[PDB]
Ligand binder design. Structure first.
Ligand SMILES: [Mg+2]
Ligand SMILES: [Mg+2]
Ligand SMILES: [Mg+2]
Ligand SMILES: [Mg+2]
Ligand SMILES: [Mg+2]
Ligand SMILES: [Mg+2]
Ligand SMILES: [Mg+2]
Ligand SMILES: [Mg+2]
Ligand SMILES: [Mg+2]
Ligand SMILES: [Mg+2]
Ligand SMILES: [Mg+2]
Ligand SMILES: [Mg+2]
Ligand SMILES: [Mg+2]
Ligand SMILES: [Mg+2]
Ligand SMILES: [Mg+2]
Ligand SMILES: [Mg+2]
Ligand SMILES: [Mg+2]
Ligand SMILES: [Mg+2]
Ligand SMILES: [Mg+2]
Ligand SMILES: [Mg+2]
Ligand SMILES: [Mg+2]
Ligand SMILES: [Mg+2]
Ligand SMILES: [Mg+2]
Ligand SMILES: [Mg+2]
Ligand SMILES: [Mg+2]
Ligand SMILES: [Mg+2]
Ligand SMILES: [Mg+2]
Ligand SMILES: [Mg+2]
Ligand SMILES: [Mg+2]
Ligand SMILES: [Mg+2]
Ligand SMILES: [Mg+2]
Ligand SMILES: [Mg+2]
Ligand SMILES: [Mg+2]
Ligand SMILES: [Mg+2]
Ligand SMILES: [Mg+2]
Ligand SMILES: [Mg+2]
Ligand SMILES: [Mg+2]
Ligand SMILES: [Mg+2]
Ligand SMILES: [Mg+2]
Ligand SMILES: [Mg+2]
Ligand SMILES: [Mg+2]
Ligand SMILES: [Mg+2]
Ligand SMILES: [Mg+2]
Ligand SMILES: [Mg+2]
Ligand SMILES: [Mg+2]
Ligand SMILES: [Mg+2]
Ligand SMILES: [Mg+2]
Ligand SMILES: [Mg+2]
Ligand SMILES: [Mg+2]
Ligand SMILES: [Mg+2]
Ligand SMILES: [Mg+2]
Ligand SMILES: [Mg+2]
Ligand SMILES: [Mg+2]
Ligand SMILES: [Mg+2]
Ligand SMILES: [Mg+2]
Ligand SMILES: [Mg+2]
Ligand SMILES: [Mg+2]
Ligand SMILES: [Mg+2]
Ligand SMILES: [Mg+2]
Ligand SMILES: [Mg+2]
Ligand SMILES: [Mg+2]
Ligand SMILES: [Mg+2]
Ligand SMILES: [Mg+2]
Ligand SMILES: [Mg+2]
Ligand SMILES: [Mg+2]
Ligand SMILES: [Mg+2]
Ligand SMILES: [Mg+2]
Ligand SMILES: [Mg+2]
Ligand SMILES: [Mg+2]
Ligand SMILES: [Mg+2]
Ligand SMILES: [Mg+2]
Ligand SMILES: [Mg+2]
Ligand SMILES: [Mg+2]
Ligand SMILES: [Mg+2]
Ligand SMILES: [Mg+2]
Ligand SMILES: [Mg+2]
Ligand SMILES: [Mg+2]
Ligand SMILES: [Mg+2]
Ligand SMILES: [Mg+2]
Ligand SMILES: [Mg+2]
Ligand SMILES: [Mg+2]
Ligand SMILES: [Mg+2]
Ligand SMILES: [Mg+2]
Ligand SMILES: [Mg+2]
Ligand SMILES: [Mg+2]
Ligand SMILES: [Mg+2]
Ligand SMILES: [Mg+2]
Ligand SMILES: [Mg+2]
Ligand SMILES: [Mg+2]
Ligand SMILES: [Mg+2]
Ligand SMILES: [Mg+2]
Ligand SMILES: [Mg+2]
Ligand SMILES: [Mg+2]
Ligand SMILES: [Mg+2]
Ligand SMILES: [Mg+2]
Ligand SMILES: [Mg+2]
Ligand SMILES: [Mg+2]
Ligand SMILES: [Mg+2]
Ligand SMILES: [Mg+2]
Ligand SMILES: [Mg+2]
Ligand SMILES: [Mg+2]
Ligand SMILES: [Mg+2]
Ligand SMILES: [Mg+2]
Ligand SMILES: [Mg+2]
Ligand SMILES: [Mg+2]
Ligand SMILES: [Mg+2]
Ligand SMILES: [Mg+2]
Ligand SMILES: [Mg+2]
Ligand SMILES: [Mg+2]
Ligand SMILES: [Mg+2]
Ligand SMILES: [Mg+2]
Ligand SMILES: [Mg+2]
Ligand SMILES: [Mg+2]
Ligand SMILES: [Mg+2]
Ligand SMILES: [Mg+2]
Ligand SMILES: [Mg+2]
Ligand SMILES: [Mg+2]
Ligand SMILES: [Mg+2]
Ligand SMILES: [Mg+2]
Ligand SMILES: [Mg+2]
Ligand SMILES: [Mg+2]
Ligand SMILES: [Mg+2]
Ligand SMILES: [Mg+2]
Ligand SMILES: [Mg+2]
Ligand SMILES: [Mg+2]
Ligand SMILES: [Mg+2]
Ligand SMILES: [Mg+2]
Ligand SMILES: [Mg+2]
Ligand SMILES: [Mg+2]
Ligand SMILES: [Mg+2]
Ligand SMILES: [Mg+2]
Ligand SMILES: [Mg+2]
Ligand SMILES: [Mg+2]
Ligand SMILES: [Mg+2]
Ligand SMILES: [Mg+2]
Ligand SMILES: [Mg+2]
Ligand SMILES: [Mg+2]
Ligand SMILES: [Mg+2]
Ligand SMILES: [Mg+2]
Ligand SMILES: [Mg+2]
Ligand SMILES: [Mg+2]
Ligand SMILES: [Mg+2]
Ligand SMILES: [Mg+2]
Ligand SMILES: [Mg+2]
Ligand SMILES: [Mg+2]
Ligand SMILES: [Mg+2]
Ligand SMILES: [Mg+2]
Ligand SMILES: [Mg+2]
Ligand SMILES: [Mg+2]
Ligand SMILES: [Mg+2]
Ligand SMILES: [Mg+2]
Ligand SMILES: [Mg+2]
Ligand SMILES: [Mg+2]
Ligand SMILES: [Mg+2]
Ligand SMILES: [Mg+2]
Ligand SMILES: [Mg+2]
Ligand SMILES: [Mg+2]
Ligand SMILES: [Mg+2]
Ligand SMILES: [Mg+2]
Ligand SMILES: [Mg+2]
Ligand SMILES: [Mg+2]
Ligand SMILES: [Mg+2]
Ligand SMILES: [Mg+2]
Ligand SMILES: [Mg+2]
Ligand SMILES: [Mg+2]
Ligand SMILES: [Mg+2]
Ligand SMILES: [Mg+2]
Ligand SMILES: [Mg+2]
Ligand SMILES: [Mg+2]
Ligand SMILES: [Mg+2]
Ligand SMILES: [Mg+2]
Ligand SMILES: [Mg+2]
Ligand SMILES: [Mg+2]
Ligand SMILES: [Mg+2]
Ligand SMILES: [Mg+2]
Ligand SMILES: [Mg+2]
Ligand SMILES: [Mg+2]
Ligand SMILES: [Mg+2]
Ligand SMILES: [Mg+2]
Ligand SMILES: [Mg+2]
Ligand SMILES: [Mg+2]
Ligand SMILES: [Mg+2]
Ligand SMILES: [Mg+2]
Ligand SMILES: [Mg+2]
Ligand SMILES: [Mg+2]
Ligand SMILES: [Mg+2]
Ligand SMILES: [Mg+2]
Ligand SMILES: [Mg+2]
Ligand SMILES: [Mg+2]
Ligand SMILES: [Mg+2]
Ligand SMILES: [Mg+2]
Ligand SMILES: [Mg+2]
Ligand SMILES: [Mg+2]
Ligand SMILES: [Mg+2]
Ligand SMILES: [Mg+2]
Ligand SMILES: [Mg+2]
Ligand SMILES: [Mg+2]
Ligand SMILES: [Mg+2]
Ligand SMILES: [Mg+2]
Ligand SMILES: [Mg+2]
Ligand SMILES: [Mg+2]
Ligand SMILES: [Mg+2]
Ligand SMILES: [Mg+2]
Ligand SMILES: [Mg+2]
Ligand SMILES: [Mg+2]
Ligand SMILES: [Mg+2]
Ligand SMILES: [Mg+2]
Ligand SMILES: [Mg+2]
Ligand SMILES: [Mg+2]
Ligand SMILES: [Mg+2]
Ligand SMILES: [Mg+2]
Ligand SMILES: [Mg+2]
Ligand SMILES: [Mg+2]
Ligand SMILES: [Mg+2]
Ligand SMILES: [Mg+2]
Ligand SMILES: [Mg+2]
Ligand SMILES: [Mg+2]
Ligand SMILES: [Mg+2]
Ligand SMILES: [Mg+2]
Ligand SMILES: [Mg+2]
Ligand SMILES: [Mg+2]
Ligand SMILES: [Mg+2]
Lengths: 88, 145
RNA sequence: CUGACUGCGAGGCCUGCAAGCCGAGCAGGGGCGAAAGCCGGGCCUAGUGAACCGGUGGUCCCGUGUGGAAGGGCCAUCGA
RNA sequence: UGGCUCUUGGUCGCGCCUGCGUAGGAUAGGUGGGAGCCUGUGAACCCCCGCCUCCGGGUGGGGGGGAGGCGCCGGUGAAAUACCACCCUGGCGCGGCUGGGGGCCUAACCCUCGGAUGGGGGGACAGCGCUUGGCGGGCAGUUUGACUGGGGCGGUCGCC
RNA sequence: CAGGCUCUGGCGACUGUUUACCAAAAACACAGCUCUCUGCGAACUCGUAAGAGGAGGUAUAGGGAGCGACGCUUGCCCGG
RNA sequence: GGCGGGACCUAAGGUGAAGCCGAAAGGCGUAGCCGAAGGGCAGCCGGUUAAUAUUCCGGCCCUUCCCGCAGGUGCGAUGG
RNA sequence: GGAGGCGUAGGGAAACCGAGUCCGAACAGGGCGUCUAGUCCGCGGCCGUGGACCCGAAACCGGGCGAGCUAGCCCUGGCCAGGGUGAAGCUGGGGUGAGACCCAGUGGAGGCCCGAACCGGUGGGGGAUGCAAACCCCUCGGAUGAGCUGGGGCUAGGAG
RNA sequence: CCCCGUGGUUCGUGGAGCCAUGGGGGAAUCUGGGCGGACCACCGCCUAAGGCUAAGUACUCCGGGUGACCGAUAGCGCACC
RNA sequence: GAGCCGGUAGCGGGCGUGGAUCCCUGGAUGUCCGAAUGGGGGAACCCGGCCGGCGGGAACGCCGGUCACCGCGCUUUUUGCGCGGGGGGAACCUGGGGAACUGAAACAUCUCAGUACCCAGAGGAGAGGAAAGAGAAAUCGACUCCCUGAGUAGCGGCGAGCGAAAGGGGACCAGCCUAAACCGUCCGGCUUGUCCGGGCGGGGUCGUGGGGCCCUCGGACACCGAAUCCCCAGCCUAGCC
RNA sequence: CGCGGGGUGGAGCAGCCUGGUAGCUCGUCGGGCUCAUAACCCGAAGGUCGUCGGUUCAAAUCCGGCCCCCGCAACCA
RNA sequence: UGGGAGAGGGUGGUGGAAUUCCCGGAGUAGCGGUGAAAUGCGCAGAUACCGGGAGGAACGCCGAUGGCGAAGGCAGCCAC
């Protein structure tokens, strides 16, 4: 998966092993590989309760940055999932 | 990452400063435990308010103690009290001063800011000292008659 | 003394293709001999390998809008 | 993917410094500037210490001290010793820069606990993401020539 | 309805299991022997993963390998 | 209504709120739910039809529920 | 409807030059090229790329359907006439310092024995376009066990 | 944007640009910034990291029209429950 | 505009010029299943909650309405209310994933091929679309589709193969909205500030660069005009001379 | 082909780094000694230090090229 | 009845010394071993020495021409 502000569906591509010289000649041995996106978990306070983000490595700050925009928001009262949605 | 610490932090610095620390150190400690805040373009602005406000706030408080500096320095405070031969009948504290000062003219001052602990119990004139601003004192002439 | 020369090549052997093989004579320039003349390796018939890929030197060429460079072509030569 | 702390290698300029075969007075690292110069910007000599070490000298701090203290040269040798200019071997100090090594921590992260905005254990490790090399019939695709008195084994394959 | 018996050798200890449909054996399985991995979020197995088995087990336990009741016994060679 | 099944129960297993994972389809899974020849559960003898019968009929016997009633008691649950 | 296409110029890798041009210093030689020739449509013969005369594999790959057969396991039931043998333990008595142990009686163990059901399928005969795509008769092995069996359920294609 | 791993393109590592992006470093706002096939200069082109958009095009379950299309072993598998 | 009660006669009994049958249009009714949706399930079966009704009807049964889940908005929370989704569709379309045979007279790059197939999604179409384009012309001027360019340029165990664009000729032709600068508003945060950011409205939309705020212009009457809304022409859904 | 390590007596090694020292083990010959080999003890011959060359006062030493061995990753139309 | 001696026996516990091993500290070219020497051990850091730890076995001096028991046989230390 990768479903966060990131949106990085892990796409597969070719991973080919090459034997050669480089400045003499070159050949190969091709295969198919799935390139996953570096994705870590991010827990954060955010008003009441807590909240987790199965986000990528790239867009880590984007989260805490969003938590900033969240101070300019009015939320409360048992909002586990609903925080995320109402969180942009 | 650039952050704004609102707390006297040893290694970092004093309150209000802006220092860039290691990402994690701020993401998993400072910011979370409420010591500093991610110094975004947003907070950098609200910080200028903290500066400009507090600045012209005391800069206009010292600019007002600049008016009392001009008038309380070129004026004598005559106090009509009774006295035997040397020492005073009643007794003048810091109240009998800020009081007859607010009356004889209308100047508003506190017997608290007025630098005097001694309950004047002698007749004659002296040179008091008032403290409206920490760095701009005013010598208030006395005249206990 | 360095013809184990460069630019060439009428004609012809051989032969399915490709490859192989002989060579008069021309021009430049050079060796030997007085000269005629001979010399484009070894008395001759085995001592070897299409092409692709790339290497090294060189060069009238090409060079992505333009000068230039990268890269490439061309002559030389290398790795079965 | 974080806090602290000890430690250590690289490295750039700059500060200070070690480098003694004999001869020549000697313990002249290189080439040269230069016979003038160091000293009250207090010296020769003494007394204490860090350090290099060829075993003898050198060099920095501090104190006693009070007017001297070096040198070319002739000499001898490969060259010369006032002070000075730069640099080489190796070293010490400074900060920048960057990496290695060890220990403690807690908050990421993981485990765990009569549910916990918490307590305990692990802990910048592990897990995972990208990249690196390696091992790797566990699995995959595929090769394994031809002539040949059948094939296989054997012999042969071009050229004279 | 209702064992023919005895002696002697080979293999496998034994009851068991197998090639449905040409092989029931001397094959496999076995108890017991030995080696080896595994300190637990175990090793190993299936799964991309979540997870599950292992096991609500903990080295007198679990995974793998070989040998195959029991008796006597198991020699020398790490050069590859 | 009485035998068998359901308006009862749970087993492996399935399903699956919560929750977790997966490029999609989907995969895992607590609670509950589903799932039985298992647990719980009130009919015995005889007669009669061309063909059905503890089912219709006879005899004897029984269960659940609702309503009302007399009497007794802190009654009451998916919870112990 | 002239966009476009073939043709009216060739030589050279190209720059370029041009009835010529390339190698080369060449006014040598030689390779290629000028001396003019075509296009468009129809039809036919042959070739290319298509399944490409017609019929035929063994295979391979994708997605999906099956454990009502067969194998293992999970869940809950059921079944196994009769006869034989006679372990432990137990009781009594003997024995010893106590005991070991011995004897008798009791007792009812066992991948025990024999033998139906039940399961299976050793040896022979038949059967062989069969009663039957595995049967029949005789015979034989197991038969309280690692037993047989009903119903409920799980596992599958490089997978079980 | 740069680098590492790759896809698209006629582009199979190749002088490999351009467009896209899995990992890492990580910026500016017109004195900005991409591009015209490495890279530099010069000259010209174009404004990325938000979204929308008729028509011309695809197809034929369905209705119609037509056939140098078949005429029951043909023609859809089936003219016929 | 004369017959009719399908195929379909017969048995039996009726209907129609007070204009049926039949053809079209709209409406009514539409058991149970199936996305199935109150809950269960082995489709067409099984049981149930709440309001209302029927029957002596309290038990029991029947009838009518109603009760799945997920998304966005409304609800300051829970509980409710509204809008929408789910599933099917021959072929077609975009996206996500993606073979092998076969060919190279072997085979592993390459080929088949982004083909087959899987999955999701859309609609009468889809996709794409106004330039961070093209490419050498101080040239073109969204996108799509046809011809051509061209089997060219080029790609390639330079093998087998693979194979584009600019431009030109045609079809059709359409260009707009926004984010940010800047101004106003409602809410809570709080470190309470001339602010932070949320929503809302005004503003603004660009390549000779454009926009914003200020200054001058007179700055508006005007002009452009729907890809929306209303009407109508015509047109398909039975027929008639 | 690119990288780095060395060649030292009949043989190997320390000297090399940061030149002033040919030394070490065994063999071998003679001497001591023993029953005897050996241990062990004394002395001795043999090295242009692989080569050519350069700087220096002196070069095995530091350096350039040349010959060879050994090691290293890589490469093969 | 009362006293004594003893390594008599069995059980539980326990003390120091030393060996080897491992950790840490310091330190460098040799250690070890025989008649001699080698194999072996050590520049990856041994031997020697210092500190901490683990484990097993046997009990110095007292101890003797000693004591004890049927014989075999019996020894640090405490209790039963
Ligand atoms: Mg990151
Ligand atoms: Mg990052
Ligand atoms: Mg809400
Ligand atoms: Mg910004
Ligand atoms: Mg006065
Ligand atoms: Mg007075
Ligand atoms: Mg001459
Ligand atoms: Mg020849
Ligand atoms: Mg001549
Ligand atoms: Mg000749
Ligand atoms: Mg010859
Ligand atoms: Mg010859
Ligand atoms: Mg030239
Ligand atoms: Mg030149
Ligand atoms: Mg040019
Ligand atoms: Mg070239
Ligand atoms: Mg060569
Ligand atoms: Mg780290
Ligand atoms: Mg790290
Ligand atoms: Mg970091
Ligand atoms: Mg790091
Ligand atoms: Mg450090
Ligand atoms: Mg240090
Ligand atoms: Mg440093
Ligand atoms: Mg002398
Ligand atoms: Mg002397
Ligand atoms: Mg001076
Ligand atoms: Mg002193
Ligand atoms: Mg003193
Ligand atoms: Mg001094
Ligand atoms: Mg002094
Ligand atoms: Mg003195
Ligand atoms: Mg002189
Ligand atoms: Mg230095
Ligand atoms: Mg630093
Ligand atoms: Mg730093
Ligand atoms: Mg540590
Ligand atoms: Mg710790
Ligand atoms: Mg602690
Ligand atoms: Mg801790
Ligand atoms: Mg913790
Ligand atoms: Mg703690
Ligand atoms: Mg984190
Ligand atoms: Mg847990
Ligand atoms: Mg916790
Ligand atoms: Mg560590
Ligand atoms: Mg890590
Ligand atoms: Mg790898
Ligand atoms: Mg292996
Ligand atoms: Mg294989
Ligand atoms: Mg292999
Ligand atoms: Mg194949
Ligand atoms: Mg081969
Ligand atoms: Mg053959
Ligand atoms: Mg022949
Ligand atoms: Mg033969
Ligand atoms: Mg025998
Ligand atoms: Mg047997
Ligand atoms: Mg057997
Ligand atoms: Mg046996
Ligand atoms: Mg045996
Ligand atoms: Mg079996
Ligand atoms: Mg069986
Ligand atoms: Mg069987
Ligand atoms: Mg069989
Ligand atoms: Mg048989
Ligand atoms: Mg048998
Ligand atoms: Mg078997
Ligand atoms: Mg066996
Ligand atoms: Mg055995
Ligand atoms: Mg695995
Ligand atoms: Mg588990
Ligand atoms: Mg378990
Ligand atoms: Mg369990
Ligand atoms: Mg075991
Ligand atoms: Mg065996
Ligand atoms: Mg055996
Ligand atoms: Mg043995
Ligand atoms: Mg053996
Ligand atoms: Mg032997
Ligand atoms: Mg070995
Ligand atoms: Mg070994
Ligand atoms: Mg009911
Ligand atoms: Mg269950
Ligand atoms: Mg499920
Ligand atoms: Mg499930
Ligand atoms: Mg379950
Ligand atoms: Mg079910
Ligand atoms: Mg079920
Ligand atoms: Mg039952
Ligand atoms: Mg009864
Ligand atoms: Mg009747
Ligand atoms: Mg009755
Ligand atoms: Mg009553
Ligand atoms: Mg009570
Ligand atoms: Mg009660
Ligand atoms: Mg009670
Ligand atoms: Mg009560
Ligand atoms: Mg009660
Ligand atoms: Mg041409
Ligand atoms: Mg050409
Ligand atoms: Mg030529
Ligand atoms: Mg000619
Ligand atoms: Mg002509
Ligand atoms: Mg002509
Ligand atoms: Mg012609
Ligand atoms: Mg012609
Ligand atoms: Mg003609
Ligand atoms: Mg024709
Ligand atoms: Mg033809
Ligand atoms: Mg032909
Ligand atoms: Mg053909
Ligand atoms: Mg055929
Ligand atoms: Mg075929
Ligand atoms: Mg295949
Ligand atoms: Mg079964
Ligand atoms: Mg039975
Ligand atoms: Mg029975
Ligand atoms: Mg029996
Ligand atoms: Mg008996
Ligand atoms: Mg008995
Ligand atoms: Mg007894
Ligand atoms: Mg007894
Ligand atoms: Mg007895
Ligand atoms: Mg007894
Ligand atoms: Mg006995
Ligand atoms: Mg007994
Ligand atoms: Mg008995
Ligand atoms: Mg007995
Ligand atoms: Mg009996
Ligand atoms: Mg039995
Ligand atoms: Mg038997
Ligand atoms: Mg059976
Ligand atoms: Mg049978
Ligand atoms: Mg047999
Ligand atoms: Mg037979
Ligand atoms: Mg058997
Ligand atoms: Mg039997
Ligand atoms: Mg069963
Ligand atoms: Mg299945
Ligand atoms: Mg770029
Ligand atoms: Mg560029
Ligand atoms: Mg990226
Ligand atoms: Mg970083
Ligand atoms: Mg600006
Ligand atoms: Mg461009
Ligand atoms: Mg560019
Ligand atoms: Mg360019
Ligand atoms: Mg410029
Ligand atoms: Mg835009
Ligand atoms: Mg059309
Ligand atoms: Mg029609
Ligand atoms: Mg039609
Ligand atoms: Mg016809
Ligand atoms: Mg006809
Ligand atoms: Mg037909
Ligand atoms: Mg009819
Ligand atoms: Mg009518
Ligand atoms: Mg109708
Ligand atoms: Mg209708
Ligand atoms: Mg349904
Ligand atoms: Mg509904
Ligand atoms: Mg009701
Ligand atoms: Mg009811
Ligand atoms: Mg209802
Ligand atoms: Mg809502
Ligand atoms: Mg409310
Ligand atoms: Mg709301
Ligand atoms: Mg709500
Ligand atoms: Mg709200
Ligand atoms: Mg509403
Ligand atoms: Mg809807
Ligand atoms: Mg759909
Ligand atoms: Mg749909
Ligand atoms: Mg399609
Ligand atoms: Mg597709
Ligand atoms: Mg092929
Ligand atoms: Mg083959
Ligand atoms: Mg293939
Ligand atoms: Mg392939
Ligand atoms: Mg392709
Ligand atoms: Mg794709
Ligand atoms: Mg696709
Ligand atoms: Mg759809
Ligand atoms: Mg569209
Ligand atoms: Mg679009
Ligand atoms: Mg271009
Ligand atoms: Mg068209
Ligand atoms: Mg075309
Ligand atoms: Mg080739
Ligand atoms: Mg292709
Ligand atoms: Mg391709
Ligand atoms: Mg392609
Ligand atoms: Mg075009
Ligand atoms: Mg915004
Ligand atoms: Mg804004
Ligand atoms: Mg505002
Ligand atoms: Mg706005
Ligand atoms: Mg607007
Ligand atoms: Mg507007
Ligand atoms: Mg402007
Ligand atoms: Mg106008
Ligand atoms: Mg107008
Ligand atoms: Mg108007
Ligand atoms: Mg009209
Ligand atoms: Mg009409
Ligand atoms: Mg119409
Ligand atoms: Mg009409
Ligand atoms: Mg290197
Ligand atoms: Mg090396
Ligand atoms: Mg040696
Ligand atoms: Mg010797
Ligand atoms: Mg040498
Ligand atoms: Mg030499
Ligand atoms: Mg190699
Ligand atoms: Mg006594
Ligand atoms: Mg005693
Ligand atoms: Mg003891
Ligand atoms: Mg030694
Ligand atoms: Mg050794
Ligand atoms: Mg050594
Ligand atoms: Mg004795």
């Amino acid at each position: 998966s990768g479903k966060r502000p990131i949106v990085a569906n892990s796409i597969q591509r070719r991973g080919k092993a090459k034997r050669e010289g480089g400045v003499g000649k070159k050949t190969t041995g091709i295969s198919k590989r799935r390139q996953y996106p570096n994705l870590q978990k991010v827990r954060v306070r955010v008003a009441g309760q807590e909240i987790t983000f199965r986000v990528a490595a790239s867009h880590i700050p984007k989260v805490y940055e969003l938590v900033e925009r969240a101070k300019g928001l009015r939320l409360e009262g048992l909002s586990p999932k609903e925080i995320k949605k109402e969180l942009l | 990452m650039k952050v704004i610490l609102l707390e006297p932090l040893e290694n970092l610095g004093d309150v209000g400063q802006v220092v860039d620390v290691k990402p994690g150190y701020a993401r998993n400690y400072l910011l979370p435990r409420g010591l500093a805040v991610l110094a975004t373009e947003s907070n950098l602005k609200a910080l200028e308010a903290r500066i400009r406000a507090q600045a012209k706030r005391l800069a206009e408080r010292k600019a007002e103690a600049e008016r009392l500096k001009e008038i309380l320095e070129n004026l004598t405070l005559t106090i009509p009290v009774r006295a035997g031969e040397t020492k005073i009948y009643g007794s003048v504290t810091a109240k009998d001063i800020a009081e007859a000062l607010s009356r004889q003219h209308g100047i508003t001052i506190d017997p608290k800011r007025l630098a005097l602990e001694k309950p004047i119990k002698e007749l004659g004139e002296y040179v008091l000292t008032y403290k409206p601003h920490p760095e701009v004192p005013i010598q208030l002439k006395v005249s206990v008659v």
